[PDB]
Amino acid sequence: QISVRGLAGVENVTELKKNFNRHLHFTLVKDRNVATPRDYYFALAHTVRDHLVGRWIRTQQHYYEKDPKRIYYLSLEFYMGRTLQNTMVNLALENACDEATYQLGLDMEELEEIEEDAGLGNGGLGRLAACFLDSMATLGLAAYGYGIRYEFGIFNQKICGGWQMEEADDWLRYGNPWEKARPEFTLPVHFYGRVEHTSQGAKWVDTQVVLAMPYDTPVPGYRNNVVNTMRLWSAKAPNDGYIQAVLDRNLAENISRVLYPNDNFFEGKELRLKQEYFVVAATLQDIIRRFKSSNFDAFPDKVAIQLNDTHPSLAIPELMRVLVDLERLDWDKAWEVTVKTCAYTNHTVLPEALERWPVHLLETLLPRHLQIIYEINQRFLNRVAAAFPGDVDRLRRMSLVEEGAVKRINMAHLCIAGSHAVNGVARIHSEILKKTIFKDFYELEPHKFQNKTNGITPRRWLVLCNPGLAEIIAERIGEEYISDLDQLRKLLSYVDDEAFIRDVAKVKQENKLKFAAYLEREYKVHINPNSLFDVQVKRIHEYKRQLLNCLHVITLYNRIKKEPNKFVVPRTVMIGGKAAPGYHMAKMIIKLITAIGDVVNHDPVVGDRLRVIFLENYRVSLAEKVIPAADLSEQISTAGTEASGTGNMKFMLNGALTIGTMDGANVEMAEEAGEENFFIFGMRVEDVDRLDQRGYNAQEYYDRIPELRQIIEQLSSGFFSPKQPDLFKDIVNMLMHHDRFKVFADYEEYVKCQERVSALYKNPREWTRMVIRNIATSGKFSSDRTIAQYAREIWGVEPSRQRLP
Amino acid sequence: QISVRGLAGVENVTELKKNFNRHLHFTLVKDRNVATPRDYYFALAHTVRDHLVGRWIRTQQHYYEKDPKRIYYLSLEFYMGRTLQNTMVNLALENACDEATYQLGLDMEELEEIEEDAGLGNGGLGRLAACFLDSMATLGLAAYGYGIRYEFGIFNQKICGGWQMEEADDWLRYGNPWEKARPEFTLPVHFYGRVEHTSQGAKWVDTQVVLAMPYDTPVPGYRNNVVNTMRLWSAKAPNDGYIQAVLDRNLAENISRVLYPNDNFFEGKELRLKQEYFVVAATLQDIIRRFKSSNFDAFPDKVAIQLNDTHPSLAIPELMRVLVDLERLDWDKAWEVTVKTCAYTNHTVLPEALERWPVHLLETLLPRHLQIIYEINQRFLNRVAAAFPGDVDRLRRMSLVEEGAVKRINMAHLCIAGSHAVNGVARIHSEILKKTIFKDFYELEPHKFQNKTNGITPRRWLVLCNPGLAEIIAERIGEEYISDLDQLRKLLSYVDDEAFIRDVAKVKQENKLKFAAYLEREYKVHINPNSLFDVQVKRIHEYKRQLLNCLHVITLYNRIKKEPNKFVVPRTVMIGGKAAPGYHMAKMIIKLITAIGDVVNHDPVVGDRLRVIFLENYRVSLAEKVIPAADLSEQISTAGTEASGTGNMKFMLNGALTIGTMDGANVEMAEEAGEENFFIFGMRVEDVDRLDQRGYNAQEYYDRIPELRQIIEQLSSGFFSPKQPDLFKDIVNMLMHHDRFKVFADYEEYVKCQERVSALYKNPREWTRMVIRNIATSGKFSSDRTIAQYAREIWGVEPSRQRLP
Ligand SMILES: CC1(C)c2ccc(C(=O)O)c3c(Nc4ccc(O)cc4)n(-c4ccc(O)cc4)c(c23)C[C@@H]1O
């Protein structure tokens, strides 16, 4: 069909059909008479997976033979999405399978919709892990993703009566054709117990054992014949009245049962601590076994462990435990190895996200790790005291141990102390780390602190989800950009090219029709395809300020009612994302969005000039549908709160213009494109700080802005909940009296900036030319660039995009 | 190698090796460098399973096209054992795979030892189900086995300190290459709730739903191209704080977690009741769907439901529930259909085995079924009252409702009332049913009561486990006997044939060396291969009288110590079998066996003249090893207690002579061979009854038998437990004062009969000639004969051993 999707060679298609039919017969045990579309999806998935196997085996053999330094990306989350299209793209098989299935009478895109997302993450951090796996394989790194094979990923969200309802994400119900169970590589993980100090040294005894069974999933690089591994551990009860004892095996196996759905929030649940140690303990056993199959001097030359947030921070004391207690290294040598092995990525400054585990919980579950943590703290604070003699407050601030009613271990402090590199995920965030929350650590060890601005893979996030845009780009500049995204800057040459302008707008219109067709087919929801698609998709949080979007939406509605005869650019305002189950405010915000829609979408004076829709069950596969259809990308977090963002980058790559604050990677996106090509508004970090310094008074904004006052009175008086007039009193009260994110303070600039958005959209040519200037400068935000930096600046390995044989 | 194992055709071997290597590469994702023997086993298993798929699909299509009456064998247990060798035997692939794997450098028998038993049964009843599936496929019946896919089968038994320890039988740990999950055929099963009576009729509402997911396993007939299905249901939570709710999905899924390990004993556990309804409800939905894909007049013409014991007895009220409540048939028409559809097989007369569920438990879990059961009872008792006017005691005795402190439903009475056929499992047992425990039901409906003497499949139980014996037989009479076992009578012609006599003894000696090698390799246990192998393997129960064997073993030991210089036939006495976890006496009996061995096996005066060994973890695969090696088959249950037995038949088919009571199918085995060819001893049923009539006094036997008195004093005084002198006081006390199975009353005849056993074994030629007379007359005990009778006398279908194309 389109060239970026590869060749449908005659023999390749013939072989694909034969292997499809073989799987249908021998694997699905069906013939065409009874085969369901799901049977067809699985026959195709097995056929495509078969094309990975040779390279997968040879890649891993190649690493065994050449012994490169191995990169271990440890994460509690791998937000992978679906795998069938990604595999075909990266194997150059997409047109061939499309033709093969077409000749069999099947629509391959219909089959693709049958695959369950591997929804093993919450949001940005977990999706970063997924993009990173893709980029590390495309860059030829000997890299392994290590995580948990959750039986249930992030919950499936249903909207019922305008409210979020959570259902179990039973993604393995029909099996997983991608993974390969490796029950022969199963390893014991220990919990509880107690420490004996013998003549040999310390001994961790009387533990309860949980087995960790690895499942390996292939990670294909982009057309370089590299296939790396994602290894996900599954909890299994050890082999050794009767019925209840068998049933009680469920308790240990609950360790890998379900992903904790807290996006940016720490709740010290013991089961979550168990999950974190589970990944850490089994993974480090793997790492050490592989290292010995090559004395621990060389260990940091052969192993990098990257900690995705503090979630696997126990790797630092676990590595010490293994090196000291089992390998009998001296403490100082073991510590030198550990710090040189480990590096730590921080993802947020919000204090409620910081993992601060109660000491008594650690003492019970992991008694030897708490001892090692205390020893780490004593030695680290001795270094602090020697560098800053007499600075007692600095000692208290830097300690891994936090005092209080509940004594706790600060896992971020543990990570900094035990890592040779610490990085934030965007320039502004990494500077904030050095300036504020880790300033003490930066002053002790400035060399540790780095920036690694996040990115997204242009395979999943352009070639896969927006083949039309990838094609019109390739028609001009070739296909090299797909793994060399800075070549998109060549498109600045085409900013006055009438053909490209036409094609960019044509592609966007096709994507919008496709998304409108999706909403009609799957939900019987009708959206005006000739409206500006205004999209805010991301997890629901106060700091991301979906509520500020809500205020603007009601402003548009109230201005229409005030002057019904005045032309306004028609909009479909779309908001989607999941709220954590126990986050009352976030669930109220979802209900407000649907409640606004219930009024707006049924007002005959409004008609199709304005519609407000909550996109249900936002997840990786839905992001791939809606982001290519978006005109306006809402990135409106309070300045200083969004460490980087990555949804912002997806929209930029896919031809939406961005309205946003100078926050996270927005800053660098605007720098890359030129601020004249972004709708930047609102307080900067400095202005937020000035408000905090004098005290944020929302009443002052209410008193001075009639249009804002009108909206608050509508919320209070029940205008958006006539049957329950005080339904939204908590939102109103938070906004008026307890708003940590200063919604009102950006209201006026936001509404006026939104006016400028509409003004440009009335000029289709100039809208599209500004779009070109964004797409053309999105190259910096490829995760290949991010990974190349991690490789050279932290891991000490040189990337390579050369083909394996 | 040997002809009964088929042809190793040149192209077949070449194709097998290619498909082996394809599976190793694409399915196991290994190359030969790293492949474990388990990888090799799985590559072979997939290769062999691939050879079933075409016939499996075509068999089931054939049934769809020809619409024969379908047989549904409902059982809570399918004691299947391993599947790889059985599949190769029945597909005529065994020599070809043997040669193919040999050319790849692999020992196929080593690979076979890697397969986990599908241990989904307890003993005779569950193994009968497995043999029946094999025979119904070999006889061309459109037959389906329906059961539960237990995550954990019968526990793995370890002997530790001479005691049984139970471990979870994690048979699915490495997967199951045989089964095909059918998650698309998943069905809802309902529990709890309540009954509404509307205008339409009754309605079962407010239930909790458990999903039943079917897994299909192929059942190959013997070289007739028939492949039937065993469908096993797996419990799954329905699709619709948060974390605990996800974890609590385990509660519904516990329904299929583990097989209840009670052999012959009813404990009214609610979870077991749930399992029973689970199989019943999902299976009958399948049956009805398949029936509609062909008005319910014709339903009994198209459906037979065979109830394996009372365990799926809820099928009777469930079928009524569906026909009346959902299909809106009148009660009387629905009842006519039900009784003509259902038939019931009874497996034991022991009262403690009878399922008698508390009415309050049924009312809570299955409120509509209890209503239907009460209505069934009222109408049935009305028939009783009309046939036997004024016989009020008969009404009380026959009622489905049993009065008492806890009111209960007698599930056997439900089965008789709701079934057009009731059968026992051996002639003596089926007569006892008509004479005693079901005499009232027999007098009301004599036409209902049948016999179907049990049998065993000669595929698994001769060709598979004893290929040497199968070969020397085939060398004389051809291979037709393998599915026409009455042709073994041709071997009576060879009773004076020196070559056959030589070969029979040679085969037995090879099997004994092979089993001795097994015990050395797997347990470092040394047995004298030139000793008589005296084997009692079966579940441990008082009624099977392992204790009587114990008394004889100690007698042999005490006689040796009394006259050390006197020659005795050397024996290896082997006892194996599992005790139910909560059955104290059975566990004490295992400990006594090992305690006897601890004295006997270490007495230098005894040496290798006598050894006593407890065979650990007796299961189908171990039965296949030890039964072909046995010289003497211990079948010594108290007359009247063993309904049939089937282990007795396995030994007879495999060249052991039998010592036993006139009990169960022993009677018919002795009738078939001639009593002169069996070591029959002990009380007959009539003598047991005479003892009960006057009261069994064990003291009288103790007082009159010095050698018995000596053994009891050794047990009491601690001779077999010096470190815990009163370890066996409970056994002694039961024997002396509470022995329901009259161990002492058969002691003298047993010991003297055992003398006759030894006397014949001293004459190898006459021992072997008597063996020939047993093997030659074992043909009646083929489960093909049993199934042919079920087909013609209950199900109304005609068997056929003709090939499918
Ligand atoms: C070598 C090659 C071209 C091929 C040719 C022929 C057959 C066949 O059976 O006629 C093949 C199967 N069989 C086959 C296919 C599916 C199945 O379930 C069993 C066997 N598989 C194959 C593919 C995937 C596997 O996990 C295992 C083998 C492969 C086959 C792989 C390869 O494409």
3-state secondary structure of A776: coil
> Which of A585, A593, A545 has its CA nearest to residue A720?
A593
Instruction: Give residue for tokens 């908001």.
Output: A575
Q: Give the closest residue to A97 by CA, choosing from A131, A136, A46.
A: A46
Three-class HEC string of B610-679: EEEEEECCCCHHHHHHHHHHCCEEEECCCCCCCCCCCHHHHHHHCCCEEEECCCCCHHHHHHHHCHHHCE
Closest CA to A645 of A343, A351, A326, A425: A425
CA distance A675 to A669: 9
- A65 interfacial to chain B (CB closer than 8 Å): no
- Helix (H) or strand (E) holding B489, with range, is none
- The answer to whether residues B490 and B448 belong to one domain is no
Asked if residue B27 has its Cβ within 6 Å of ligand 1, the reply is yes
Q: What is the dihedral of CA B579, B585, B589, B592, to 10 degrees?
A: 140
Beta bridge partners of A408: A358, A402
Query: Any idea of the CA torsion for B388, B390, B396, B401, to the nearest 10 degrees?
Result: 80
Structure tokens at B61: 């299509």
**How close is the Cα of B25 to the center of ligand 1, in Å?**
10
Q: Which two tokens stand for residue A90?
A: 């990266």
CA distance A609 to A620: 29
What is the Cα–Cα distance from B126 to B77, expressed in whole angstroms?
A: 5
Bridge partners for A410 per DSSP? A356
Beta carbons within 10 angstroms of residue A774's beta carbon: 26
Q: Residue A409 forms beta bridges with which residues? A: A357, A401
Would strands A401-402 and A408-410 be described as parallel, antiparallel, or unpaired?
A: antiparallel
Q: Which atom of ligand 1 is nearest to the CA of A23?
A: 16
How would you class A186 by CB atoms within 10 Å of its CB: exposed for 0-12, middle for 13-18, buried for 19 or more?
A: middle
Answer whether A50 sits within 8 Å of B26, measured CB to CB.
yes
Q: Which amino acid is at A247?
A: L
Residues of chain B with Cβ-Cβ distance to A216 below 8 Å are: 29
Closest CA to A237 of A228, A226, A222, A247: A247
Q: Choose among A3, A129, A114, A27: nearest CA to A76.
A: A129
Q: How many CB atoms lie within 10 A of CB B64?
A: 14
Is the Cβ atom of B54 under 6 angstroms away from ligand 1?
Answer: no
Experimental method: X-ray
d(CA B646, CA B134): 15
Q: What is the DSSP string of B171-221?
A: TTTT--SS-EE-GGG-EEEEES-EEEE-SS-EEEESPEEEEEEEEEEEEE-
Kindly report the number of other CB atoms within 10 A of residue B512's CB atom. Answer: 23
Q: How far is CA A647 from CA A156, A432, A489, A633, B341, in A?
A: 20, 21, 21, 9, 62
Phi, psi of A251 (to 5 degrees): -65, -50
Could you give the CA distance from residue B578 to residue B616 in angstroms, rounded to a whole number?
A: 8
Q: Cα(B520)–Cα(B526) distance, rounded to whole angstroms?
A: 6
How many angstroms separate the CA atoms of B754 and B559, rounded?
A: 13
B601 and B727 housed in the same domain: yes
Alpha carbons B336 and A573: distance in angstroms, whole number: 64
Which protein residue's CA is at the shortest distance from atom 21 of ligand 1? B22
Annotate A628-665 with b (16+ C-beta within 10 A) or e (fewer).
bbbbbbbbbbbbbbbbbbbbbbbbbbbbbbbbbbbbbb
DSSP-based three-state secondary structure for B76 = coil
Query: Does A209 contact chain B (CB < 8 Å)?
Result: no
Sheet-wide strand order for A679-680? A610-615, A571-576, A532-537, A632-635, A657-660, A679-680
**Could you give the 3-state DSSP secondary structure of residue B399?**
coil
CB-CB contact of A617 with A522 (8 Å) = no
Cβ–Cβ < 8 Å for B134, B783: yes
Both structure tokens of A332:
């100082």
B289 is in an annotated binding site: yes
CA distances, B652 to each of B631, B647, B750, B781 (Å): 10, 9, 19, 9
3-state secondary structure of B412: helix
| Mutate: best of A23, A27, A29, partner B, most B CBs <10 A | A29
Contact yes or no for A772/A504 (Cβ under 8 A) = yes
Exposure on the CB side of residue B536, measured as CA atoms within 13 A:
25
Instruction: Using DSSP, state whether A316 is helix, strand or coil.
Output: helix
CA dihedral A469, A472, A476, A480 (to 10 degrees): 50
Inter-residue contact A515 to A671 (CB < 8 Å): no
φ/ψ of residue B432, rounded to 5:
-55, -40
> CA-CA-CA-CA torsion for B630, B631, B635, B636, nearest 10 degrees?
-130
Q: Is there a single domain that holds both residue A421 and residue A498? A: no
Give the pairing type, strands B356-358 and B303-308. Answer: unpaired
Residue B570, min C-alpha distance to chain A (Å): 38
For residue B50, which atom of ligand 1 is closest to its CA?
Answer: 19
Out of B31, B174, B258, name the one closest to residue A57 (CB). B31
Altogether, the residues listed in chain A come to a count of 805
Query: Burial code of A126-147, b = ≥16 C-beta within 10 A, e = fewer?
Result: bbbbbbbbbbbbbbbbbbbbbb
Residue nearest to atom 13 of ligand 1 (CA): A22
- Give, for B303, the enclosing helix (H) or strand (E): strand B303-308
Any chain A CB within 8 A of the CB of B36?
yes
Residue of A nearest to B251 (CA): A247
- C-beta A26 within 6 A of ligand 1: yes
> Is residue A578 within a helix (H) or strand (E), and if so which, with residue range?
none
The dihedral built from the CA positions of residue A396, A401, A407 and A411, taken in this order, carries a sign that is positive
For chain B, the straight-line distance linking the first and the last C-alpha, in angstroms and rounded, comes to 28
B138 labelled catalytic: no
How far apart CA A659 and CA A534 sit, in angstroms, is 10
Distance A47 CA to ligand 1 centre (A): 9
Integer Cα distance of A282 and A270 in angstroms: 18
Q: Cα–Cα–Cα angle for B748, B749, B751, nearest 5°?
A: 65
Question: Distance, CA A20 to ligand 1 centroid (Å)?
Answer: 10
Q: How far apart are CA B39 and CA A670, in angstroms?
A: 55
Q: Which structural domain, as residue segments, surrounds residue B674?
A: 456-782
Q: Which residues in B lie closer than 8 A to residue A261 (C-beta atoms)? A: 242
- Encoded tokens for A534: 């205004």
- Tokens 């069950």 found at: A617
CATH code assigned at B114: 3.40.50.2000
Nearest to A74 by CA among A299, A343, A412, A300: A343
Q: What distance in Å separates the CA atoms of residue A320 and residue B325, rounded to the nearest whole number?
A: 67
Closest by CA to A50, choosing from A1, A99, A93, is A93
The phi and psi torsions of B117 (rounded to 5 degrees) equal -55, 135
Structure tokens at A527: 């959206």
The number of beta carbons lying within 10 Å of the beta carbon of residue A692 is 12
Beta bridge partners of B229: B144, B218
CA of B22 relative to ligand 1 center, distance in Å:
6
Residue type, A520: E
Q: Do B31 and A269 touch (CB under 8 A)?
A: no
Task: Clarify whether residues A300 and A179 are in a common domain.
Answer: yes
Please provide the DSSP assignment of A421-440 as one string: EEEESSHHHHHHHHHTTTHH
A26, two tokens: 């021998």
Whole-angstrom distance, CA of residue B648 vs CA of residue B128: 13
- Judging by DSSP bridges, how do beta strands B156-160 and B303-308 pair with one another? unpaired
- Maximum Cα–Cα distance across chain A: 89
User: Among B124, B283, B126, B315, which Cα is nearest to B216's?
Assistant: B283
Q: Which residue is listed with tokens 């050390």?
A: B564
Let me know whether A425 and A512 are in one domain.
Answer: no
Residue numbers in A near B242 (CB within 8 A): 155, 166, 261, 581-582
| B294 is annotated as contributing to ligand binding | yes
Q: From start to end of A570-621, where are the E strands?
A: 571-576, 610-615
User: Cα of A41 to ligand 1 centre, how many Å?
Assistant: 17
Q: What gap in Å lies between CA B204 and CA B192, rounded to an integer?
A: 9
Residues B307 and B330 in one domain: yes
H helix or E strand, kind and range, residue B133? helix B124-138
Distance CA B532, CA A368 (A): 57
Q: Do B168 and A254 touch (CB under 8 A)?
A: no
A374/A471 same-domain check: no
Instruction: Report the C-alpha gap between A187 and A708 in whole angstroms.
Output: 59
Rounded to an integer, what distance in angstroms lies between the CA atom of residue B574 and that of residue B536?
Answer: 6
- Chain B contacts in chain A segment 579-598 (CB below 8 A): 581-582
What span, in angstroms and rounded, lies between the C-alpha atoms of B444 and B387? Answer: 7
In whole angstroms, give the CA distance from residue B78 to residue B179.
14
Rounded distance between C-alpha atoms, residue A48 and residue A82, angstroms: 13
Nearest one of A614, A602, A455 to A535, comparing CA atoms: A614
Q: What is the DSSP letter of A629?
A: G
SS (HEC) of B533-595: EEEEECCCCCCCCHHHHHHHHHHHHHHHHHCCCCCCCCEEEEEECCCCCCCHHHHHHHHHHHH
Q: Which of B30, B246, B581 sits opposite A257 (nearest CB)?
A: B246
DSSP classification of residue B258: B
Chain B residues touching A239 at Cβ < 8 A? 167-168, 170
Residues A524/A530, Cβ–Cβ less than 8 Å: no
Q: Percent helix, strand and coil across chain B, each rounded to 5?
A: 55, 15, 30
CA B679-B658-B577 angle, 5° bins: 130
Name the helix (H) or strand (E) containing B28: none
Buried residues in A33-52 as b, exposed as e (16+ CB within 10 A): eebeeebbbbbbbbbbbbbb
**Torsion sign (Cα): B673, B676, B678, B682:** positive
- Is there a single domain that holds both residue B180 and residue B266? yes
Report CA torsion sign: A307, A313, A315, A319.
positive
Over its C-alpha atoms, chain B yields an Rg (Å, rounded) of: 27
**Angstrom distance (rounded) from CA B630 to CA B614:** 14
Retrieve residue B121's tokens: 């049964």
Residue A433 and residue A581 in one domain? no
Structure-block tokens of residue A3: 């060239």
DSSP per residue, A283-308? HHHHHHHHHHT---TTHHHHEEEEEE
Same structural domain for residues B492 and B532?
Answer: yes
Sign of the alpha-carbon torsion through B466, B467, B470, B471? negative
Q: Please give the Cα distance from A631 to A652 (Å, whole number).
A: 10
Tokens matching residue A440 = 């003490």
Whether residue B400 contacts residue B390, with contact meaning beta carbons closer than 8 Å, is answered with no
Does B50 sit in the ligand 1 pocket, CB within 6 Å?
Answer: yes
For residue B464, give the nearest of B45, B87, B19 by alpha carbon: B87
CB-count burial class (<10 Å; 0-12, 13-18, 19+) for A358? middle
What are the helix (H) ranges across B407-452?
A: 411-417, 427-435, 439-444
Strand partners, A450: A423
Tokens of B703: 């007082």
Test the A interface: residue of B116, B167, B242 with most A CBs within 10 Å: B242
Alpha-carbon distances, residue A5 vs A170, A474, A548, A629 (angstroms):
31, 11, 40, 20
Name the burial class of residue A608, with classes exposed (0-12), middle (13-18) and buried (19+) by CB atoms within 10 angstroms of its CB.
middle
Q: In this structure, which long-range contacts are made by residues A786-789, counting pairs with CB atoms below 8 Å and at least 24 apart in sequence?
A: A786/A132, A786/A135, A786/A452, A786/A453, A786/A454, A786/A455, A787/A132, A787/A135, A787/A136, A787/A139, A787/A141, A787/A455, A788/A139, A789/A452
User: Which residues of A does the annotation mark as catalytic?
Assistant: 347, 538-539, 544, 646, 650
Name chain A contacts of B582, Cβ cutoff 8 Å: 241-242
Whether residue B512 sits in one domain with residue B395: no
Same domain, A310 and A451: yes
* Nearest CA among B614, B620, B629 for reference residue B525: B614
Distance (Å, whole) CA B772 – CA B497: 10
- Cα A628–chain centre separation: 18
Domains in chain A: how many in total? Answer: 2
